[PDB]
């Protein structure tokens, strides 16, 4: 789902 990509970008850019 393209609408979930920015959530993954957020998660990986925190840590």
């Amino acid at each position, epitope marked *: *789902n393209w*609408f979930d*990509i920015t959530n993954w*970008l957020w998660y990986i850019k925190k840590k």
Partner: antibody, heavy 122, light 109 residues
Framework: QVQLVQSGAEVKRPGSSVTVSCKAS????????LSWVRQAPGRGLEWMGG????????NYAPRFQGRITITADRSTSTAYLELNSLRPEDTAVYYC???????????????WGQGTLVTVSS | EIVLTQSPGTQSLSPGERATLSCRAS???????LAWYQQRPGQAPRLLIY???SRPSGVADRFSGSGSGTDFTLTISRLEPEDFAVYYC?????????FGQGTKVEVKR
């Protein structure tokens, strides 16, 4: 905080192409999803497509795949919609819309531009 | 493609009354990714509810969302004058996002 400002109204001839801009101020531009939604006179909202600038990842509605291009310029925090092969039924207000945050993104469109009227006419 | 049906398309109600607005999906909406928007004449839409039931800060708490799967509801506990507007549902549980056709909440007289 986040403000989306679109380019002004356009009159375009049938068969031409239109480009609408959306400049974002406040927030992070590269890692949040920007979509385009249109509304023909007296009709409902229609999602056309969107872009994630950082990855250059576009997502187009099948209805528009073949006539639409969405691009993003990280240097100016500006997104662009291009729609080709215009027909009178493309007359509409075109909105840019950016996802909200809880920040953690929510997918749903918290931030809307003011809209751009595109009139397709001879 | 997920088709969202908002029926009825118009509701005629009085100020102070409760409103419940239906959104029925043709297939299950992924992870309950269902949003509701308000739109007043000549204005851009405004997000009221996301994720079926989450309410952004700044949205009045007389608005609530519920439901899951294919059956979603927007509740307005008590209509204020500014609540007479058009309401759209949207699913974003698949890359092809779709909107319902809208329900207009108008004043009965």
């Amino acid at each position: 905080q986040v403000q989306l400002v679109q380019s002004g109204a356009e009159v375009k001839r049938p068969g031409s192409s239109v480009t609408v801009s959306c400049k974002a101020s406040g927030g992070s531009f590269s890692t949040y999803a920007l979509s385009w939604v249109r509304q023909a006179p007296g009709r409902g909202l229609e999602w056309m497509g969107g872009v994630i600038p950082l990855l250059t990842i576009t997502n187009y509605a099948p209805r528009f795949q073949g006539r639409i291009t969405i691009t993003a310029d990280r240097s100016t925090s500006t997104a662009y919609l291009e729609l080709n092969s215009l027909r009178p039924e493309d007359t509409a207000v075109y909105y840019c819309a950016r996802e909200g945050t809880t920040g953690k993104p929510i997918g749903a469109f918290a931030h809307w531009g003011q809209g751009t009227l595109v009139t397709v006419s001879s | 493609e997920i088709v969202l049906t908002q029926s009825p398309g118009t509701q005629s109600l009085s100020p102070g009354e409760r409103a419940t607005l239906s959104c029925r999906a043709s297939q299950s909406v992924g992870n309950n990714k269902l949003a509701w928007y308000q739109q007043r004449p000549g204005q851009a839409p405004r997000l009221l509810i996301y994720g079926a039931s989450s309410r952004p800060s700044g949205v009045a708490d007389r608005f609530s969302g519920s439901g899951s799967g294919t059956d979603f509801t927007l509740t307005i506990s008590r209509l204020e004058p500014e609540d007479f507007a058009v309401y759209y549902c949207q699913q974003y549980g698949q890359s092809l996002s779709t909107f319902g056709q809208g329900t207009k909440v108008e004043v009965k007289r």
